[PDB]
Coordinates of C-alpha atoms and ligand atoms in Angstrom, one line a residue:
Chain Q
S3 CA -64.1 67.8 80.5
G4 CA -62.1 71.0 80.1
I5 CA -65.2 73.0 78.8
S6 CA -66.9 75.3 81.2
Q7 CA -70.7 74.9 81.3
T8 CA -73.6 77.3 81.8
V9 CA -77.4 77.0 82.4
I10 CA -79.3 76.9 79.1
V11 CA -83.1 77.4 78.9
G12 CA -85.2 76.7 75.9
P13 CA -85.8 76.0 73.1
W14 CA -88.9 78.0 72.2
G15 CA -90.3 77.6 68.8
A16 CA -90.3 74.6 66.3
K17 CA -89.4 71.0 67.2
Chain B
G1 CA -82.8 75.7 58.9
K2 CA -79.2 76.6 59.9
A3 CA -78.4 75.9 63.6
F4 CA -76.4 78.5 65.4
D5 CA -74.8 78.7 68.8
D6 CA -73.0 81.8 70.1
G7 CA -72.1 80.2 73.4
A8 CA -71.8 82.2 76.6
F9 CA -70.3 85.7 77.2
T10 CA -70.2 88.2 80.1
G11 CA -73.2 90.3 79.1
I12 CA -75.2 91.9 76.2
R13 CA -74.5 95.3 74.7
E14 CA -76.7 95.3 71.6
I15 CA -79.3 93.1 69.8
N16 CA -79.8 93.5 66.1
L17 CA -82.7 91.7 64.6
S18 CA -85.0 91.9 61.6
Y19 CA -88.7 91.1 61.1
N20 CA -91.6 91.3 58.7
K21 CA -95.0 92.5 60.0
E22 CA -96.8 89.8 58.1
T23 CA -94.5 86.8 58.7
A24 CA -91.9 86.4 61.4
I25 CA -88.5 87.3 62.8
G26 CA -85.7 86.8 60.2
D27 CA -82.2 87.8 61.2
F28 CA -80.6 87.9 64.6
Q29 CA -77.1 89.2 65.8
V30 CA -75.9 90.1 69.2
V31 CA -73.1 92.4 70.3
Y32 CA -71.9 90.7 73.5
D33 CA -69.8 92.0 76.3
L34 CA -66.7 90.0 76.9
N35 CA -64.8 90.9 80.0
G36 CA -65.7 94.6 79.6
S37 CA -65.0 94.8 75.8
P38 CA -67.5 94.5 73.0
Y39 CA -67.6 91.2 71.1
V40 CA -69.5 91.3 67.8
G41 CA -71.3 88.0 67.5
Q42 CA -71.9 86.1 64.3
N43 CA -74.8 87.6 62.2
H44 CA -77.4 84.8 61.9
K45 CA -79.3 85.5 58.7
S46 CA -82.4 84.3 57.1
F47 CA -82.1 82.4 53.8
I48 CA -84.3 85.2 52.4
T49 CA -84.1 89.0 52.6
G50 CA -86.4 92.0 52.7
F51 CA -86.8 92.2 56.5
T52 CA -87.0 95.4 58.5
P53 CA -83.9 95.8 60.6
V54 CA -84.0 96.9 64.3
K55 CA -81.0 97.8 66.6
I56 CA -81.5 97.6 70.3
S57 CA -78.5 99.4 72.0
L58 CA -78.5 98.8 75.7
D59 CA -76.9 101.2 78.2
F60 CA -74.5 98.4 79.3
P61 CA -73.7 97.5 82.1
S62 CA -76.5 99.2 84.0
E63 CA -79.3 98.3 81.6
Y64 CA -80.0 94.5 81.0
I65 CA -82.8 92.3 79.8
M66 CA -85.2 91.1 82.5
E67 CA -87.7 89.3 80.2
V68 CA -87.8 87.9 76.7
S69 CA -91.2 87.2 75.3
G70 CA -92.8 86.4 72.0
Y71 CA -95.2 84.3 69.9
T72 CA -94.6 81.1 68.0
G73 CA -96.8 80.2 65.1
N74 CA -97.3 78.9 61.6
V75 CA -95.9 80.6 58.5
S76 CA -96.1 78.6 55.3
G77 CA -96.5 75.3 57.2
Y78 CA -93.5 76.0 59.5
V79 CA -93.6 76.7 63.2
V80 CA -91.4 79.7 63.7
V81 CA -90.9 82.6 66.2
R82 CA -93.3 85.2 64.9
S83 CA -92.5 88.0 67.3
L84 CA -90.1 89.0 70.1
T85 CA -90.2 91.5 72.8
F86 CA -87.2 92.4 75.1
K87 CA -87.9 94.1 78.4
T88 CA -85.0 95.6 80.3
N89 CA -84.8 97.1 83.8
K90 CA -85.3 100.5 82.0
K91 CA -87.3 100.1 78.8
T92 CA -89.4 97.7 76.6
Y93 CA -88.3 97.0 73.1
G94 CA -91.0 95.5 70.8
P95 CA -93.0 93.7 70.0
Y96 CA -91.3 93.1 66.7
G97 CA -93.1 90.8 64.2
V98 CA -96.6 89.3 64.4
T99 CA -98.2 88.9 67.8
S100 CA -100.3 85.8 67.2
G101 CA -99.9 82.1 67.9
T102 CA -98.6 80.5 71.1
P103 CA -97.1 83.0 73.6
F104 CA -93.9 82.2 75.6
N105 CA -92.0 84.3 78.0
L106 CA -88.8 84.1 80.1
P107 CA -88.8 86.6 83.0
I108 CA -85.6 86.7 85.1
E109 CA -85.6 87.6 88.8
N110 CA -81.9 87.0 89.3
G111 CA -79.2 86.4 86.7
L112 CA -78.4 87.4 83.1
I113 CA -78.8 86.3 79.6
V114 CA -75.2 85.8 78.4
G115 CA -75.7 84.0 75.1
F116 CA -78.1 82.7 72.4
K117 CA -78.4 79.6 70.3
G118 CA -81.1 78.4 67.9
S119 CA -81.9 77.8 64.2
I120 CA -82.9 80.1 61.3
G121 CA -84.3 79.0 57.9
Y122 CA -86.5 81.6 56.1
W123 CA -87.4 82.6 59.7
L124 CA -86.1 82.1 63.2
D125 CA -87.3 78.5 63.9
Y126 CA -86.4 78.2 67.6
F127 CA -84.0 79.6 70.1
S128 CA -82.5 79.0 73.6
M129 CA -80.6 81.3 76.0
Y130 CA -77.6 80.9 78.2
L131 CA -78.1 82.2 81.7
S132 CA -75.5 83.1 84.3
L133 CA -74.9 85.1 87.5
Chain Y
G1 CA -45.3 96.1 87.9
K2 CA -47.9 96.2 85.1
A3 CA -51.3 94.9 86.0
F4 CA -53.1 92.5 83.7
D5 CA -56.5 90.9 83.8
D6 CA -57.5 88.5 81.0
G7 CA -61.0 87.9 82.4
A8 CA -62.9 84.6 82.2
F9 CA -63.3 82.2 79.3
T10 CA -64.6 78.7 78.5
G11 CA -61.3 76.8 79.2
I12 CA -57.6 76.7 78.6
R13 CA -55.9 75.5 75.4
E14 CA -52.2 76.6 75.9
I15 CA -50.0 78.4 78.4
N16 CA -46.9 80.2 77.1
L17 CA -44.6 81.4 79.9
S18 CA -41.0 82.3 80.4
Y19 CA -38.7 81.6 83.4
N20 CA -35.1 81.9 84.6
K21 CA -33.6 79.0 86.6
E22 CA -31.8 81.5 88.9
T23 CA -34.6 84.0 89.5
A24 CA -38.4 83.7 88.8
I25 CA -41.2 83.6 86.3
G26 CA -41.1 86.3 83.6
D27 CA -43.6 86.4 80.7
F28 CA -47.1 84.9 80.9
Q29 CA -49.6 84.4 78.1
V30 CA -52.6 82.1 77.7
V31 CA -54.5 80.8 74.7
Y32 CA -58.0 80.3 76.2
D33 CA -61.0 78.5 74.7
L34 CA -63.9 80.8 74.0
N35 CA -67.0 78.8 73.1
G36 CA -64.9 76.4 71.0
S37 CA -62.6 78.9 69.3
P38 CA -59.1 79.7 70.5
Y39 CA -58.8 83.1 72.1
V40 CA -55.3 84.4 72.0
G41 CA -54.7 86.2 75.2
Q42 CA -52.3 89.3 75.3
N43 CA -48.7 88.4 76.0
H44 CA -47.9 89.8 79.4
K45 CA -44.2 90.6 79.1
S46 CA -41.5 91.1 81.7
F47 CA -39.7 94.5 81.6
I48 CA -36.5 92.4 81.2
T49 CA -35.1 89.8 78.8
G50 CA -33.0 86.6 79.5
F51 CA -35.9 84.1 80.1
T52 CA -36.4 80.6 78.7
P53 CA -39.8 80.2 77.0
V54 CA -42.0 77.1 77.4
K55 CA -45.1 76.2 75.6
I56 CA -47.6 74.1 77.5
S57 CA -50.0 72.8 74.8
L58 CA -53.0 71.1 76.3
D59 CA -55.1 68.4 74.6
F60 CA -58.2 70.5 75.1
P61 CA -60.9 69.6 76.0
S62 CA -59.9 66.1 77.3
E63 CA -56.9 67.6 79.2
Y64 CA -57.4 70.3 81.9
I65 CA -55.5 71.7 84.8
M66 CA -56.2 70.0 88.2
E67 CA -53.6 71.8 90.4
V68 CA -51.5 75.0 90.1
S69 CA -48.7 75.2 92.6
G70 CA -45.5 77.2 93.1
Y71 CA -43.3 79.2 95.3
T72 CA -43.3 82.9 96.1
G73 CA -40.1 84.6 97.3
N74 CA -37.5 87.4 97.3
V75 CA -35.8 88.4 94.1
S76 CA -33.8 91.6 94.2
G77 CA -35.9 92.7 97.3
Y78 CA -39.3 92.0 95.7
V79 CA -41.7 89.3 96.5
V80 CA -42.5 87.5 93.3
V81 CA -43.7 84.2 91.9
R82 CA -40.5 82.2 91.7
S83 CA -41.8 79.0 90.4
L84 CA -45.0 77.5 88.8
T85 CA -46.1 73.9 88.2
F86 CA -49.2 72.9 86.4
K87 CA -50.7 69.5 87.0
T88 CA -53.3 68.2 84.6
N89 CA -55.4 65.0 84.5
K90 CA -52.8 63.8 82.0
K91 CA -49.4 65.0 83.3
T92 CA -47.3 67.5 85.2
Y93 CA -45.6 70.5 83.6
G94 CA -42.8 72.1 85.6
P95 CA -41.6 73.2 88.1
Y96 CA -40.5 76.2 86.0
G97 CA -38.4 78.8 87.7
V98 CA -36.8 78.4 91.2
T99 CA -38.4 76.1 93.8
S100 CA -37.5 78.3 96.8
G101 CA -39.4 80.4 99.3
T102 CA -43.0 80.0 100.5
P103 CA -45.0 77.3 98.8
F104 CA -48.6 77.7 97.6
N105 CA -51.0 75.5 95.8
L106 CA -54.5 75.5 94.4
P107 CA -55.8 71.9 93.8
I108 CA -59.2 71.6 92.2
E109 CA -61.5 68.9 93.1
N110 CA -64.3 70.1 90.9
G111 CA -64.3 73.0 88.5
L112 CA -62.0 74.6 86.0
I113 CA -59.5 77.5 85.7
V114 CA -61.0 79.8 83.1
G115 CA -58.9 83.0 83.5
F116 CA -55.8 84.7 85.0
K117 CA -55.1 88.1 86.3
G118 CA -52.0 89.5 88.1
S119 CA -49.1 91.8 87.6
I120 CA -45.7 91.5 86.0
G121 CA -42.7 93.8 86.5
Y122 CA -39.3 92.3 86.1
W123 CA -41.0 89.2 87.2
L124 CA -44.5 87.9 87.8
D125 CA -45.4 89.8 91.0
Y126 CA -48.7 88.0 91.8
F127 CA -51.6 86.3 90.1
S128 CA -55.2 85.2 90.7
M129 CA -57.4 82.7 88.8
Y130 CA -61.0 82.7 87.7
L131 CA -62.8 79.5 88.5
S132 CA -65.9 78.1 87.0
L133 CA -67.9 74.9 86.6
Chain M
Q2 CA -77.5 93.3 89.8
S3 CA -75.5 94.9 87.0
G4 CA -75.4 93.6 83.5
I5 CA -71.9 92.1 84.0
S6 CA -71.6 88.3 84.6
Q7 CA -69.6 87.3 87.7
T8 CA -67.1 84.4 88.3
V9 CA -65.4 83.0 91.4
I10 CA -61.8 84.3 91.7
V11 CA -59.1 82.8 94.0
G12 CA -55.9 84.6 94.8
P13 CA -53.7 86.6 94.7
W14 CA -50.5 84.6 95.4
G15 CA -47.3 86.5 95.3
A16 CA -46.6 90.1 96.5
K17 CA -49.3 91.5 98.8
Chain G
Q2 CA -76.0 64.6 83.5
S3 CA -77.6 63.8 86.9
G4 CA -80.1 65.5 89.2
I5 CA -77.4 66.6 91.6
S6 CA -76.4 70.3 91.6
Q7 CA -72.7 70.8 91.5
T8 CA -70.4 73.4 93.0
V9 CA -66.7 74.4 92.6
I10 CA -64.5 72.5 95.2
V11 CA -60.9 73.5 95.9
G12 CA -58.4 71.4 97.9
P13 CA -57.5 69.3 99.6
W14 CA -55.0 70.9 101.9
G15 CA -53.2 69.0 104.6
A16 CA -52.0 65.5 104.0
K17 CA -53.8 65.5 100.5
Chain D
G1 CA -101.9 85.1 98.5
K2 CA -99.3 84.3 101.1
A3 CA -95.7 84.6 99.7
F4 CA -93.4 81.6 100.1
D5 CA -89.7 81.2 99.2
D6 CA -88.1 77.8 99.8
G7 CA -84.7 79.0 98.6
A8 CA -82.2 76.9 96.8
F9 CA -81.1 73.2 97.4
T10 CA -79.2 70.4 95.6
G11 CA -82.1 69.0 93.6
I12 CA -85.6 67.8 93.8
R13 CA -86.9 64.5 95.2
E14 CA -90.7 64.9 95.2
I15 CA -93.4 67.4 94.4
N16 CA -96.6 67.4 96.3
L17 CA -99.4 69.5 94.8
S18 CA -103.2 69.7 94.7
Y19 CA -105.5 70.9 92.0
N20 CA -109.1 71.2 90.9
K21 CA -110.0 71.1 87.2
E22 CA -112.8 73.6 87.8
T23 CA -110.4 76.1 89.2
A24 CA -106.6 76.0 89.6
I25 CA -103.6 74.6 91.5
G26 CA -104.0 74.7 95.2
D27 CA -101.3 73.4 97.6
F28 CA -97.6 73.1 96.8
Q29 CA -94.9 71.3 98.7
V30 CA -91.5 70.1 97.7
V31 CA -89.1 67.5 99.1
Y32 CA -85.7 68.8 98.0
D33 CA -82.4 67.1 98.0
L34 CA -79.9 68.7 100.3
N35 CA -76.5 67.3 99.8
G36 CA -77.8 63.7 99.3
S37 CA -80.4 63.8 102.0
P38 CA -84.2 64.6 101.7
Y39 CA -85.2 68.1 102.8
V40 CA -88.9 68.4 103.6
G41 CA -90.0 71.8 102.5
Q42 CA -92.9 73.6 104.2
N43 CA -96.3 72.8 102.9
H44 CA -97.6 75.9 101.2
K45 CA -101.4 75.4 101.6
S46 CA -104.4 76.9 99.8
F47 CA -106.7 79.0 102.1
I48 CA -109.5 76.6 100.9
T49 CA -110.0 72.8 100.5
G50 CA -111.6 70.5 97.9
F51 CA -108.5 69.8 95.9
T52 CA -107.2 66.5 94.5
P53 CA -103.7 65.6 95.7
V54 CA -100.8 64.7 93.5
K55 CA -97.4 63.3 94.6
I56 CA -94.7 63.3 92.0
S57 CA -91.9 61.0 93.5
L58 CA -88.8 61.2 91.3
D59 CA -86.2 58.6 91.0
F60 CA -83.5 61.0 92.4
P61 CA -80.8 61.5 91.2
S62 CA -81.2 59.5 87.9
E63 CA -84.5 61.3 87.2
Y64 CA -84.8 65.1 87.0
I65 CA -87.1 67.7 85.6
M66 CA -86.3 68.9 82.0
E67 CA -89.4 71.1 81.5
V68 CA -92.0 72.9 83.6
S69 CA -95.1 74.1 81.7
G70 CA -98.6 75.2 82.5
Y71 CA -101.3 77.8 82.0
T72 CA -102.2 81.0 83.8
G73 CA -105.8 82.2 83.8
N74 CA -108.6 84.0 85.5
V75 CA -110.5 82.1 88.3
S76 CA -113.2 84.2 90.0
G77 CA -111.4 87.4 88.8
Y78 CA -108.0 86.3 89.9
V79 CA -105.0 85.5 87.7
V80 CA -103.6 82.2 88.9
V81 CA -101.7 79.1 87.8
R82 CA -104.5 76.9 86.5
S83 CA -102.3 74.0 85.3
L84 CA -98.9 72.5 85.7
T85 CA -97.0 69.8 83.8
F86 CA -93.5 68.4 84.9
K87 CA -91.6 66.6 82.2
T88 CA -88.5 64.6 83.3
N89 CA -85.8 62.7 81.4
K90 CA -87.9 59.6 82.2
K91 CA -91.6 60.5 81.8
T92 CA -94.3 63.3 81.9
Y93 CA -96.3 64.2 85.0
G94 CA -99.5 66.1 84.3
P95 CA -101.2 68.2 83.1
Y96 CA -102.7 68.8 86.5
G97 CA -105.5 71.4 85.9
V98 CA -107.2 72.6 82.8
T99 CA -104.9 73.6 79.9
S100 CA -106.8 76.9 79.2
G101 CA -105.5 80.4 79.4
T102 CA -102.1 81.9 78.7
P103 CA -99.5 79.1 78.3
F104 CA -96.0 79.3 79.7
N105 CA -93.1 76.8 79.5
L106 CA -89.6 76.6 80.8
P107 CA -87.6 73.9 79.0
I108 CA -84.1 73.3 80.3
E109 CA -81.3 72.2 78.0
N110 CA -78.7 72.3 80.7
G111 CA -79.1 72.8 84.4
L112 CA -81.4 71.9 87.2
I113 CA -84.4 73.4 89.1
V114 CA -83.2 73.6 92.7
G115 CA -85.9 75.7 94.4
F116 CA -89.3 77.3 94.2
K117 CA -90.8 80.5 95.4
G118 CA -94.3 82.0 94.8
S119 CA -97.5 83.0 96.4
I120 CA -100.6 80.9 97.3
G121 CA -104.1 82.3 98.2
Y122 CA -107.1 80.3 97.3
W123 CA -104.9 79.2 94.4
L124 CA -101.3 79.3 93.3
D125 CA -101.0 83.0 92.3
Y126 CA -97.5 82.9 90.8
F127 CA -94.2 81.1 91.1
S128 CA -90.5 81.3 90.2
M129 CA -87.8 78.7 90.1
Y130 CA -84.2 78.7 91.2
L131 CA -81.8 77.1 88.6
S132 CA -78.3 75.9 89.0
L133 CA -75.7 73.7 87.4
Chain X
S3 CA -72.4 89.9 101.4
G4 CA -72.2 86.5 102.9
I5 CA -75.2 84.9 101.2
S6 CA -74.7 82.7 98.2
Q7 CA -76.7 83.6 95.0
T8 CA -78.6 81.5 92.4
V9 CA -80.2 82.2 89.0
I10 CA -84.0 82.7 89.4
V11 CA -86.5 82.6 86.5
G12 CA -90.1 83.7 86.8
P13 CA -92.5 84.7 88.0
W14 CA -95.3 83.1 85.9
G15 CA -98.8 83.8 87.1
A16 CA -100.3 87.0 88.6
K17 CA -98.7 90.4 89.2
Chain S
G1 CA -59.3 59.0 109.4
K2 CA -63.0 59.2 109.0
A3 CA -64.0 61.1 105.9
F4 CA -66.6 63.8 106.1
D5 CA -68.5 65.9 103.5
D6 CA -71.0 68.5 104.6
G7 CA -71.8 69.6 101.0
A8 CA -72.8 73.1 100.0
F9 CA -74.9 75.6 101.7
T10 CA -75.8 79.3 101.4
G11 CA -73.0 80.6 103.6
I12 CA -71.3 80.3 107.0
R13 CA -72.6 81.5 110.4
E14 CA -70.3 79.9 112.9
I15 CA -67.2 77.7 113.0
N16 CA -66.5 75.5 116.0
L17 CA -63.1 73.9 116.1
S18 CA -60.7 72.5 118.7
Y19 CA -57.0 72.4 118.8
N20 CA -54.0 71.6 121.1
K21 CA -50.9 73.9 121.0
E22 CA -48.7 70.8 121.3
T23 CA -50.3 68.8 118.5
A24 CA -52.9 69.9 115.8
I25 CA -56.5 70.7 115.0
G26 CA -58.9 68.2 116.5
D27 CA -62.6 68.7 115.9
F28 CA -64.5 70.7 113.4
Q29 CA -68.2 71.7 113.1
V30 CA -69.8 74.4 111.1
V31 CA -73.1 76.2 111.5
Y32 CA -74.1 77.1 108.0
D33 CA -76.7 79.4 106.6
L34 CA -79.3 77.6 104.5
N35 CA -81.5 80.2 102.7
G36 CA -81.4 82.7 105.6
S37 CA -81.8 80.0 108.4
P38 CA -79.1 78.4 110.5
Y39 CA -78.2 74.9 109.6
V40 CA -76.2 73.0 112.3
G41 CA -73.6 70.8 110.5
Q42 CA -72.4 67.4 111.6
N43 CA -69.8 67.6 114.3
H44 CA -66.6 66.0 113.0
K45 CA -64.8 64.7 116.0
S46 CA -61.3 63.4 116.5
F47 CA -60.9 59.7 117.7
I48 CA -59.2 61.2 120.8
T49 CA -60.2 64.0 123.2
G50 CA -58.4 66.6 125.2
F51 CA -58.6 69.5 122.8
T52 CA -59.4 73.2 123.6
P53 CA -62.6 74.3 121.9
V54 CA -63.1 77.6 120.1
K55 CA -66.2 79.2 118.6
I56 CA -65.9 81.7 115.8
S57 CA -69.3 83.5 115.7
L58 CA -69.5 85.5 112.5
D59 CA -71.7 88.5 112.1
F60 CA -73.6 86.8 109.2
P61 CA -74.4 88.0 106.5
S62 CA -72.2 91.2 106.6
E63 CA -69.1 89.2 107.8
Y64 CA -67.6 86.5 105.6
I65 CA -64.3 84.6 105.3
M66 CA -61.9 86.1 102.7
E67 CA -58.9 83.7 103.3
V68 CA -58.2 80.4 105.0
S69 CA -54.6 79.6 105.9
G70 CA -52.7 77.2 108.0
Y71 CA -49.8 74.8 108.4
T72 CA -49.5 71.1 107.7
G73 CA -46.9 69.1 109.8
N74 CA -46.0 65.7 111.2
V75 CA -47.5 64.9 114.6
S76 CA -46.6 61.6 116.2
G77 CA -46.1 60.1 112.7
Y78 CA -49.2 61.6 111.2
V79 CA -49.2 64.4 108.6
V80 CA -52.1 66.7 109.6
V81 CA -53.4 70.2 109.7
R82 CA -51.5 71.7 112.6
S83 CA -52.9 75.2 112.5
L84 CA -55.8 77.2 111.0
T85 CA -56.4 81.0 110.6
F86 CA -59.7 82.4 109.3
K87 CA -59.5 86.0 108.0
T88 CA -62.8 87.7 107.4
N89 CA -63.7 91.2 106.0
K90 CA -63.9 92.2 109.6
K91 CA -61.1 90.5 111.5
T92 CA -58.6 87.6 111.8
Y93 CA -59.5 84.5 113.9
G94 CA -56.4 82.6 114.9
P95 CA -54.0 81.1 114.4
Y96 CA -55.3 78.2 116.3
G97 CA -52.8 75.3 116.9
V98 CA -49.2 75.1 116.1
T99 CA -47.8 77.4 113.3
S100 CA -45.1 74.9 112.2
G101 CA -44.5 73.0 109.0
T102 CA -45.6 73.6 105.4
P103 CA -47.9 76.7 104.9
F104 CA -51.0 76.7 102.7
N105 CA -53.5 79.5 102.0
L106 CA -56.7 80.0 100.1
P107 CA -57.4 83.7 99.5
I108 CA -60.7 84.6 97.8
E109 CA -61.1 87.6 95.7
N110 CA -64.6 86.9 94.6
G111 CA -67.0 84.3 95.9
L112 CA -67.9 82.5 99.2
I113 CA -66.9 79.4 101.0
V114 CA -70.2 77.4 101.3
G115 CA -69.1 74.0 102.6
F116 CA -66.3 71.8 103.9
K117 CA -65.2 68.2 103.4
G118 CA -62.1 66.4 104.7
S119 CA -61.0 63.7 107.0
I120 CA -60.4 63.6 110.7
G121 CA -58.5 60.8 112.6
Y122 CA -56.6 61.7 115.7
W123 CA -56.4 65.1 114.0
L124 CA -57.7 67.0 111.0
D125 CA -55.9 65.2 108.2
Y126 CA -57.0 67.4 105.3
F127 CA -59.9 69.5 104.0
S128 CA -61.4 71.0 100.9
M129 CA -63.9 73.9 100.5
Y130 CA -67.0 74.3 98.3
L131 CA -67.0 77.8 96.7
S132 CA -69.9 79.6 95.2
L133 CA -71.1 83.0 94.0
Ligands
LIG201 C1 -114.9 86.2 95.8 C2 -114.0 85.2 95.8 C3 -114.4 84.0 95.1 C4 -113.5 83.0 95.0 O1 -113.9 82.0 94.3 O2 -112.3 83.0 95.6 C5 -111.9 84.1 96.3 C6 -110.6 84.2 96.9 C7 -110.2 85.3 97.6 O3 -109.0 85.3 98.2 C8 -107.8 85.4 97.3 O4 -107.0 84.2 96.8 C9 -106.6 84.7 95.5 C10 -106.3 83.7 94.4 O5 -105.4 82.7 94.9 C11 -105.5 85.9 95.7 O6 -104.3 85.3 96.3 C12 -106.0 87.0 96.7 O7 -105.0 87.8 97.1 C13 -106.7 86.4 97.9 O8 -107.3 87.4 98.7 C14 -111.1 86.4 97.7 C15 -112.3 86.4 97.1 C16 -112.8 85.2 96.4

């Protein structure tokens, strides 16, 4: 796809 | 709660949050850097009010966050982020909130926090961070 | 000419450029994506008029540029960008301008163009592209 | 590092 | 989503 | 402890560790992927023996780690990593070692762990992780 | 310089 | 031709190529850096022999490639890379081969070449480059 991606860490907290 | 997702930017200039010393973190808003200009992010607000506001104004670009830490715990039967601390290469900001429950921490050796996402009801329920070089 | 540098974004939604079939590329402007919202880039304008405008509206995010190519060459004693062609996964836009001089091309096997910078005087003098995953 | 995120940049093509 | 890291790749040049 | 730093690779094929419930994590060794081939990292050994070995053989590249968690704690007056758990998109490996002390966790929403660095004495003193897209 | 860079998170543990 | 793909590494220490000033580029082998250590790439060899070998030994890590350029042209019925030049921050290596046909160039303003792929038959048919921060 045409959307740039990035590292994402988490989540912290609920669920 | 209400999910939010700021996406990714080129850096962080300012963090605005609110908290209550007896419950948890309430509101959260970031002023990002976007290609050398400030970008005022959406203000992610609790469904309730009466929190104490805090403004963390970083000396961008030389000052940046190296560690985010906090506690998650129970407030009125909900698991929420009860406290946050932001440590930069220059200063520590916090703790804000209540320092009890389960601790968590994200220290960064190389790279930058460039964005936040998460969910906020009465309190910040959970959050994640975008990281980049 | 006048330098410009849009910086880096999430993707590309539209390119608006102008050209002359006897000279070179003139105006250049881009609507980026920024975390799902259109970001209207500044219109980088030639010092002169007489160009034909073209609007390259991409079906973002399913459509994205896979190759940028063109020619650079003499116009009035200046080395400028004479022609551009944009090839996406869905079709080819251009050539726009004059297909004469020294060819260049940037095919992408993996990754995306997320930003442009360069300089425009009477014509587009030069440009560079930000690339990201 | 600095607090400014970095990106690959290719180019310039055109005038030197 | 796979367990293989990815990288920007530009080209090809030559015969394509 | 002795510092180690594997650097960054393409992915992870296997983790070899050892542990003792009475103490902490001992040895640590990783078989990385390097461009589609196995790269056998150096075995980073504890100074002592008596550990139970664990081999985590992932179904690379279909299977990859989505969360690393564990506990740090005092063993014989030293702060060390007492426990580790590796959660993939397929199953959960661990906990290896007692889940007592200060918890930590690194869930990954997008991205991959591609390398480890740290320090091992009698036990794993500390570690960090390289992350990439 | 000529050496590629990567995001690193950590350390967790001592020090 | 036989396809090749080295994948991505940490940087480049040495390039070994061969050429003939009557034909085109023949063989290609790279010594990469892999996390501060040399990694000897596969040697990608032409189906025929007779080429003149050249070794470009870079002063890694201070010296790195800023632009790759060359020409593609027809040799005995095959369209191939007839010439290569590598410009670093220290000096220009080449051109090697025959500077005749259609030019191409990849200048890099920010980032590093960390890998090569392509195809070699009688001559280097084509190639692509992995780029990283
Ligand atoms: C007194 C003592 C008792 C014990 O059970 O273990 C050790 C270990 C020692 O070596 C240290 O290993 C630790 C923890 O991994 C640190 O890396 C430290 O730097 C090492 O010297 C020393 C004494 C004992």
